[PDB]
Amino acid sequence: GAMGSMERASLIQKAKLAEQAERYEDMAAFMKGAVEKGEELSCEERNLLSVAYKNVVGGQRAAWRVLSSIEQKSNEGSEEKGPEVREYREKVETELQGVCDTVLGLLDSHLIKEAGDAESRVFYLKMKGDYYRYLAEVATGDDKKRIIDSARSAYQEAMDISKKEMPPTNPIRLGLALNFSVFHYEIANSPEEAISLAKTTFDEAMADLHTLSEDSYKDSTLIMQLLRDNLTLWT
Amino acid sequence: GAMGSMERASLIQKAKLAEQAERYEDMAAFMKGAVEKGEELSCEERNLLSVAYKNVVGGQRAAWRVLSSIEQKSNEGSEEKGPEVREYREKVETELQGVCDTVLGLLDSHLIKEAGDAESRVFYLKMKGDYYRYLAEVATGDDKKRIIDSARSAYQEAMDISKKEMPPTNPIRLGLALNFSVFHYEIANSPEEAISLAKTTFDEAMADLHTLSEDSYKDSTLIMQLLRDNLTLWT
Ligand SMILES: [Ca+2]
Ligand SMILES: [Ca+2]
Ligand SMILES: [Ca+2]
Ligand SMILES: [Ca+2]
Ligand SMILES: [Mg+2]
Ligand SMILES: [Mg+2]
Ligand SMILES: [Mg+2]
Ligand SMILES: [Mg+2]
């Protein structure tokens, strides 16, 4: 790998600089190099990995949605324009799939198997569900159902651990539940499960806020608002 | 080149799709492929080329400024942090220089020499001044003065043609004058020349607005406002 000659600490330092410069592709490459050093990631380092790839894939998903919509309209009274829209949508789609496969590969070799604490294991399993979810958004062929089930299975294992090992206000647990609820609504055609999950998560967090410091209260209530935003949109 | 097998029309079509998807690196690559087909560019195609590269280099310049500022602070009571900030600033700088060299290469081979109409020749010479200006922003060594003079010379030839062949409200002429005034203020250490140029350009355009249609009036007054914005900032 092209980061093989750079010190782990320097990769982390440069990932933080790339974040400040909004250079998320660089940030992701630096964090991939850091993961490939083979040592486990601290909490801050895990967040850097997630921020980098979420931003890279988020731009790819936004572009794919623009191009997919143009492609949809072209296939309605619409004039034939040739293969270009499909080709370019496919190009962006293949790039997106490549990023998802890269992230999933880092999780499989070997972040998840070395993650023993609940906070790291839940974090990585949530990421696995997220990146299979992004693959599912663009899937159409023989493995769409298997891709969806891979996302479900990762989210489910993360939920089981998070419920047993974390308080209901833990921001990792809240963000996992938020994303699993989105999976239910957007991927699994299960809006009732999505609503039930978001509501139960919100209510159980509400009841636990009294145990928190002012700073933790701020952290948890911010994610609760994201759950509330979805419930308002979905109900 | 990787676009050598794609039709010129398909490259143009995909450049427009990439713009809609805010995929400016792709847009630039498509427009580079279109230029390399060897045919002259229409007015719309010239604008696509400029939009693509302006957005790519604009992101690089913003990142370089962030990293340069961090580097400045590190060299003031500041703790020694190693070579990483300089290395990463250099990496972004080298990428930026590569983009500028790519654009300048397309202008030199062979867009400028085939551009005979004032509107195309002024457009390309303005681009030449712009991309030498971006090189000058990061230059420090033996050729900084020669880089600055290359920007000046391109802008000056574009100004001479634009003054002889275009009305003072022409949006190309206005945008050239805007950028040459920025060159004077930011690159050539000539704020009085920058102010004089912006003011004279604004006033000569004002006096010509009566000749324009409603749509052309809108086009010209928008760029005049950019000149006014700079004058307000600089005076
Ligand atoms: Ca080492
Ligand atoms: Ca028709
Ligand atoms: Ca052809
Ligand atoms: Ca100190
Ligand atoms: Mg290396
Ligand atoms: Mg119901
Ligand atoms: Mg090709
Ligand atoms: Mg004075």
| Domain spans of chain A, in order of start | 8-234
A92 interaction partners in chain B (CB closer than 8 Å) = 21, 23
Taking the C-alpha atoms of residue B32 and residue B103, their distance in angstroms, rounded to an integer, is 8
Considering only CB atoms, B66 lies closest to which of A20, A67, A88, namely A20
Q: What is the Å distance from ligand 3's center to B7 Cα?
A: 5
Taking the C-alpha atoms of residue B107 and residue B117, their distance in angstroms, rounded to an integer, is 15
Instruction: List C-alpha distances in Å: B1 to A88, A198, B12, B114.
Output: 18, 51, 16, 21
**Given resolution (angstroms):** 1.5
The bound ligand whose nearest atom lies closest to the alpha carbon of B33 is 7
Q: Which residue of A has its CA nearest to B81?
A: A13
Instruction: List C-alpha distances in Å: A167 to A95, A164, A171, A181, A209.
Output: 38, 8, 9, 18, 10
Q: Please report where in the chains the tokens 């979810």 appear, as a residue.
A: A133
CA dihedral angle for residue B7, residue B12, residue B16, residue B21, rounded to 10 degrees: 40
Taking the C-alpha atoms of residue A209 and residue A69, their distance in angstroms, rounded to an integer, is 42
- Residue B42 carries which DSSP code? P
Q: Which residue of A has its CA nearest to B19?
A: A63
A33 interaction partners in chain B (CB closer than 8 Å) = none
Q: Which fold has domain A8-234?
A: Delta-Endotoxin; domain 1 (1.20.190)
Chain A contact for B82, CB < 8 A?
Answer: yes
The bound ligand whose nearest atom lies closest to the alpha carbon of A193 is 6
The bound ligand whose nearest atom lies closest to the alpha carbon of A199 is 6
Chain B contact for A94, CB < 8 A?
Answer: no
Give the Cβ contact number of residue A146 at 10 Å: 11
Taking the C-alpha atoms of residue B55 and residue B60, their distance in angstroms, rounded to an integer, is 9
Q: Which two tokens stand for residue A232?
A: 């308002």
How many Cβ pairs closer than 8 A exist between chain A and B?
A: 58
Fill in the amino acid letter for B206: M
Technique used by the depositors: X-ray
Considering only CB atoms, B21 lies closest to which of A22, A23, A66, namely A66
DSSP A132-193: HHHHHHH--STTHHHHHHHHHHHHHHHHHHHHHHS-TT-HHHHHHHHHHHHHHHHTSS-HHH
Give the Cβ contact number of residue A199 at 10 Å: 16
Contacts of A140 (CB under 8 A, 6+ apart): none
Contacts of A74 (CB under 8 A, 6+ apart): A81, A85
Considering only CB atoms, B85 lies closest to which of A17, A87, A92, namely A17
Nearest chain B Cα distance for residue A179, angstroms? 25
DSSP chain A: -TTTTS-HHHHHHHHHHHHHTT-HHHHHHHHHHHHTT-SPPPHHHHHHHHHHHHHHHHHHHHHHHHHHHHHHHHT--PPP--SHHHHHHHHHHHHHHHHHHHHHHHIIIIIHHH--SHHHHHHHHHHHHHHHHHHHHH--STTHHHHHHHHHHHHHHHHHHHHHHS-TT-HHHHHHHHHHHHHHHHTSS-HHHHHHHHHHHHHHHHTTGGGS-HHHHHHHHHHHHHHHHHHHHH-
Q: Please report where in the chains the tokens 């050539």 appear, as a residue.
A: B188
Phi, psi of A156 (to 5 degrees): -65, -45
Could you tell me if residue B167 is left (phi over 0), alpha (psi between -120 and 50 degrees) or otherwise beta? beta
Cβ neighbourhood burial of B194 (10 Å; 0-12, 13-18, 19+)? buried
Contacts of B157 (CB under 8 A, 6+ apart): B125
A63 interaction partners in chain B (CB closer than 8 Å) = 21-23
CB contact under 8 A, B63 and A21: yes
Contact A138/A99 with Cβ under 8 angstroms?
A: no
Burial B197-221 (b: 16+ CB within 10 A, else e): bbbebbebbeeeeeebeeeeeeebb
Q: Which two tokens stand for residue B194?
A: 């920058």
Contact B53/B28 with Cβ under 8 angstroms?
A: yes
Could you tell me if residue A6 is left (phi over 0), alpha (psi between -120 and 50 degrees) or otherwise beta? beta
Taking the C-alpha atoms of residue B102 and residue B131, their distance in angstroms, rounded to an integer, is 10
Which residues 28-57 on chain A approach chain B with CB closer than 8 angstroms?
A: none
CB contact under 8 A, B13 and A62: no
